[PDB]
A paper describes a structure:
Human sirtuin isoform 2 ([name]) is an NAD+-dependent enzyme that functions as a lysine deacetylase and defatty-acylase. By catalyzing the removal of protein acyl modifications, [name] regulates diverse processes including cancer growth, neurodegeneration, metabolism, and inflammation. The acyl substrates of [name] are chemically diverse and range from small modifications such as acetyl-lysine to much larger, fatty modifications such as myristoyl-lysine. Here, we report that [name] readily dimerizes in solution and in cells and that dimerization affects its ability to remove different acyl modifications from substrates. In this work, we report our observations that [name] does indeed oligomerize in solution, favoring a homodimer at concentrations greater than ∼100 nM.
The experiments above strongly indicated that the interaction of SIRT2cat with the myristoyl modification on the [name] peptide was essential for driving the dimer to monomer transition. To better visualize this, we cross-linked SIRT2cat while bound to a fluorescein-labeled, myristoyl-[name] peptide called “[name]-myristoyl-[name]”. This fluorescent myristoyl peptide also caused a SIRT2cat transition from dimer to monomer (lane 4). We also mixed SIRT2cat and [name]-myristoyl-[name] peptide at 52 μM each and analyzed their complex with SEC, which confirmed that the protein/peptide complex was monomeric. [name]-myristoyl-[name] peptide and the unlabeled myristoyl-[name] peptide had nearly identical affinity for SIRT2cat using a gel shift assay (Kd = 1–2 μM), and SIRT2cat processes [name]-myristoyl-[name] peptide as a conventional myristoyl substrate. Instead, we hypothesized that the position of interface residues should change between the structures of apo-SIRT2cat and myristoyl peptide-bound SIRT2cat if that interface was altered during substrate binding and was important for the dimer to monomer transition. Thus, we aligned our crystal structure of SIRT2cat bound to myristoyl peptide to each molecule of the apo-SIRT2cat trimer to observe structural differences at Interface 1 or Interface 2. The backbone atoms near Interface 1 overlapped perfectly in the aligned structures and did not change their position when SIRT2cat was substrate-bound. On the other hand, the C-terminal helix at Interface 2 tilted inward 4° on its hinge when the protein was bound to myristoyl peptide, suggesting Interface 2 had a structural change that could affect protein dimerization. Five of the residues were on the SIRT2cat C-terminal helix, and the sixth residue we mutated (Q142) dramatically repositioned to contact the C-terminal helix in myristoyl peptide-bound SIRT2cat, but not apo-SIRT2cat.
Residue numbers in the entry:
A (entry chain B): 14 to 18
B (entry chain A): 57 to 97, 114 to 297, 305 to 355
Write the structure that this text describes.
Amino acid sequence: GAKRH
Amino acid sequence: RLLDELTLEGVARYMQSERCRRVICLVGAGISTSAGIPDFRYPEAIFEISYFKKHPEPFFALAKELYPGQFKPTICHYFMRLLKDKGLLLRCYTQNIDTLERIAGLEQEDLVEAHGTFYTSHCVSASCRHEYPLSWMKEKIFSEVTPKCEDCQSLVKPDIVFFGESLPARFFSCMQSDFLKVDLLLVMGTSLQVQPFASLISKAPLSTPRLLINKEKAGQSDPFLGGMDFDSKKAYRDVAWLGECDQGCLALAELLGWKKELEDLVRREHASIDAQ
Ligand SMILES: *C(=O)CCCCCCCCCCCCC
Ligand SMILES: [Zn+2]
């Protein structure tokens, strides 16, 4: 989904 | 097992074979460090969208301090330009926002800018969304003036994906089609720690060879948590070349008989940029 680290 | 040997030499022989027609590159910050763009490897909020919405000034202050003095693509970028020009490049997925792929001559059709780009900026107001070029963004950043829209005075934001934001729609539509038909994955300058970008490696067919050019081995499955398998007795398709991206691409070019072509291209393009 979203930009994740 | 399409590689005859799990080495750079084996990948080079594979790319010269009839079977290798469609190459996808996956690239990250390690392909731009030799161009002066820093790899960034509470303080992590400066790139998270929730804080940026609350206070955008520290991001634009940071952007001024880290804006590169010149935009000169690296040997790695021009290796991808050779892939395009030789008809091998299906797509370059980049985590980078620095526009160097475009300057090296990759076209928007060639590129999935998975994390956005500074190449363009937009007013954030839903009803306006006026677009601004990097020239305009650069002068607002360097004037230490928070960029505001000239039509509605809302904030103007570079077209980058902040942490916590969804990736662009084009990332998912391209990946759904590209990875059905990829002959070779070239993974350069990324340690595959950012999601969902890193999951791209597991989308290729299980028979597709994957070359990692990077300072460290990356993408292996975590022993606690489609992973790369370089060194097990079952390793059959993944190769790790450990070093600087420029040197790895120069080595692969030489094996392909492209070394003179790559050197001539870099020198001429760099001379042209230096002359602007
Ligand atoms: C997600 O990984 C994107 C992170 C964006 C970092 C922004 C840093 C700002 C400095 C970039 C200026 C150079 C671009 C022309
Ligand atoms: Zn506006």
